């Protein structure tokens, strides 16, 4: 599961 910070920032 991806939260918004995962979707936007985590490489």
């Amino acid at each position, epitope marked *: 599961r991806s939260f918004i910070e995962d979707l936007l*920032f985590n*490489k």
Partner: antibody, heavy 126, light 107 residues
Framework: QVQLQESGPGLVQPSQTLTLTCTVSGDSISNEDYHWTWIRQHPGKGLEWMGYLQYSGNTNYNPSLKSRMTISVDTSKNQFSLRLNSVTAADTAVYFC??????????????????WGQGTLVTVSS | YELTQPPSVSVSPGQMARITCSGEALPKKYAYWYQQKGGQFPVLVIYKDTERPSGIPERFSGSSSGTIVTLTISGVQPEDEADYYCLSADTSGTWVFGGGTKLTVLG
């Protein structure tokens, strides 16, 4: 696609509580996909992210502001709001409401801010 | 956590503009470049270090070198005169704007 409109600009006295609303049209404020966001910009200075709130209660606030600010929701009016305590001249800014959308099952998100208002000028002055 | 940009980049039309943004967490966190004109809400011109959104002119590009990311505008036009902000996050999940860079198109 939602349309966001901040409440009207004006004065707030030093040490008082700044209060702003953002009225959302086109979808429900209670939908968890939306990260209801506030951003501000002191005139002549840079942009500052303040934080977001989701209707579940999940929050993510700027760490320097987290003990001064609250984002909340008014379901009856389909609004979210900003409360900033004990304001000073440092808090004079254009305040923009915005939102960021996460759809269940999306794996590629392009826009950090999907929809936004055009800001409202709060002047902290006695 | 602070994202550091040059305060101003003064460039005549046609010259190449390069705006950097440095932060110690950029090797692990994507950067986003925003364009602001006339105090309005900023417009995304480059996302995830290198990608160009649709409707954005091809003259805008972006690269990454670990702790420093660079927005590059080839064929700078008078319309590109704006303030530019990088957006990223720290390792705690706080979204962070860079200090902003004023691109002046002199001449």
């Amino acid at each position: 696609q939602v349309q966001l409109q901040e409440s009207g600009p004006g004065l707030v006295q030093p040490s008082q509580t700044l209060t702003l609303t953002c009225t959302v049209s086109g979808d429900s404020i209670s939908n968890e996909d939306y990260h209801w966001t506030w951003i501000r910009q002191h005139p002549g200075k840079g942009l500052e992210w303040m934080g977001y709130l989701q209707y579940s209660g999940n929050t993510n606030y700027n760490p320097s502001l987290k003990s001064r600010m609250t984002i909340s929701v008014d379901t009856s009016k389909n609004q979210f709001s900003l409360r900033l305590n004990s304001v000073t001249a440092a808090d004079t800014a254009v305040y923009f409401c915005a939102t960021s959308i996460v759809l269940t099952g999306m794996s590629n998100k392009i826009q950090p801010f999907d929809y936004w208002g055009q800001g409202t000028l709060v002047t902290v002055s006695s | 956590y602070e994202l550091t940009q040059p305060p101003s980049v003064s460039v005549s039309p046609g010259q190449m503009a390069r705006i950097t943004c440095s932060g110690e967490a950029l090797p692990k966190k994507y950067a986003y470049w925003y364009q602001q004109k006339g105090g309005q809400f900023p417009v995304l011109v480059i996302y995830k270090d290198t990608e160009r959104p649709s409707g954005i002119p091809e003259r805008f590009s972006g690269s990454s070198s670990g702790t420093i990311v660079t927005l590059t505008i080839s064929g700078v036009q008078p319309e590109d005169e704006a303030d530019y902000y990088c957006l990223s996050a720290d390792t705690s999940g706080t979204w962070v704007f860079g200090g902003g860079t004023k691109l002046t198109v002199l001449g």
